[PDB]
Write a protein that binds this ligand. Sequence first.
Ligand SMILES: [Cl-]
Ligand SMILES: [Cl-]
Ligand code: NA
Ligand SMILES: [Ru+3]
Length: 129
Amino acid sequence: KVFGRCELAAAMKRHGLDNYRGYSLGNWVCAAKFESNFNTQATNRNTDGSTDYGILQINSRWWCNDGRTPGSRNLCNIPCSALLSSDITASVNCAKKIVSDGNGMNAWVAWRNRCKGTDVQAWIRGCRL
Ligand SMILES: [Cl-]
Ligand SMILES: [Cl-]
Ligand code: NA
Ligand SMILES: [Ru+3]
């Protein structure tokens, strides 16, 4: 599923991301924009042999099991394929754990390089929430 900008903002709020660990909703939306272009089915292979999955490109090195990432952890306790679903629950639940683990949203390098410090509120501007 490719979400609409406002459609995702709403979905994210419904699923509890708005201000989760102090990160306003626009942060989450901007991160999803640059990680996956709002496509739940986005996958990208990392040079280390891990893969990133879904709307927030969650990595199989630490967070989900894909069965082909040597020496890796599955800290969110899910198959990485659950992160590709048109239902964002597993993505959101896992993102809450990731953002809680110490570095905040800096875990998402596109967030750090492309969203952090910007007018992230523009990403939710106009949306019925
Ligand atoms: Cl594995
Ligand atoms: Cl933080
Ligand atoms: Na893994
Ligand atoms: Ru503004």
